[PDB]
């Protein structure tokens, strides 16, 4: 059920309004590679999102 972790985390990345396509691709690919890093990657995405608000 590693893909359920991917799916949940990926939708949370999709929810972020301020990432460009390059950045979305970066985080999604990292999630795709290793779902156990989701909590960390989301934190990183949210921080980057907010800095680009």
């Amino acid at each position: 059920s590693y893909n359920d972790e991917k799916k949940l985390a990926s939708n949370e990345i999709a929810n972020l309004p301020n990432l460009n396509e390059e950045q979305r691709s970066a985080f999604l690919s990292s999630i795709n590679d290793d779902p156990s890093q989701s909590a960390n990657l989301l934190a990183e995405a949210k921080k980057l999102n907010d800095a680009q608000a």
Epitope: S1, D4, K7, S10, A14, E21, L28, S29
Partner: antibody, heavy 120, light 107 residues
Framework: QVTLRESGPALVKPTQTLTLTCTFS??????????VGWIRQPPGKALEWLAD???????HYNPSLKDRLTISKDTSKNQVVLKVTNMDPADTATYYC????????????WGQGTTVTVSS | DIQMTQSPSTLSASVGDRVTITCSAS?????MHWYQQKPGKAPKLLIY???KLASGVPSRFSGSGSGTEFTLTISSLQPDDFATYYC?????????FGGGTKVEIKR
């Protein structure tokens, strides 16, 4: 809207390698989170997932295919190619390609399928 | 890997009947999806994320479940519901399908 179309030989000999091509429209495989997968269905049997490829070039293969599979993409041309080595009459089937997304993990649009027969 | 058994494998019901197909998985998945396949056609997404209706799918269709036990329901069987239905899990690789349930119409 999204459409996919499989193409390849209708007939291949035992031991030969099969090359199938999926050509699609309505979406791009360079889009973040996008994927194409391949599924087959022997006459009168259930569907069996074979492989998938992701926009980031990540690939997965079904162990049931015993390392016989190679998948690749040409994002430029909206094509995904699947190769299957050492074909056997047990591989006679209709072969489908279909779109997946990392937000979904389900195939939401499929091609019409292309029928392959393995015979001398 | 994760495998699924559907029951029944063959089903015969009259028009207007309510029909239920079950899918039991060998281990817990977060979602079950369902495909409908008509004779000579590719599978078509029917239910996704366990209970969500795919586009162009009548309210007649519904899905339920959680853990290892999922069901697809058709609330008023119509002639055009003649098909084989497959459950599908994308929660773990390899992706897998149930063995299918052929739905026949009594008349």
């Amino acid at each position: 809207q999204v459409t996919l179309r499989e193409s390849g030989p209708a007939l291949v000999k035992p031991t030969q390698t099969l090359t199938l091509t999926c050509t699609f429209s309505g979406f791009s495989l360079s889009t973040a989170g996008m994927s194409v997968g391949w599924i087959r269905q022997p006459p009168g049997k259930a569907l069996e997932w074979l492989a998938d490829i992701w926009w980031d070039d990540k690939k997965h293969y079904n162990p049931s295919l015993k390392d016989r599979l190679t998948i690749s993409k040409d994002t430029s041309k909206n094509q995904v190619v699947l190769k299957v080595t050492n074909m056997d009459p047990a591989d006679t089937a209709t072969y489908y390609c279909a779109r997946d997304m990392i937000f979904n993990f389900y195939f939401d649009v499929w091609g019409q399928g292309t029928t392959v027969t393995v015979s001398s | 890997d994760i495998q699924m058994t559907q029951s029944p494998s063959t089903l015969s019901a009259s028009v207007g009947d309510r029909v239920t197909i079950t899918c039991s998985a060998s281990s817990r998945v977060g979602y079950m999806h369902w495909y409908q396949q008509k004779p000579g056609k590719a599978p078509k997404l029917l239910i996704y994320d366990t209970s969500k209706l795919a586009s162009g799918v009548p309210s007649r269709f519904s899905g339920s479940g959680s853990g290892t036990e999922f069901t697809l329901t058709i609330s008023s069987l119509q002639p055009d519901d003649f098909a084989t239905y497959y459950c599908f899990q994308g929660s773990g690789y390899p992706f897998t399908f149930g063995g299918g349930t052929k739905v026949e119409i009594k008349r």
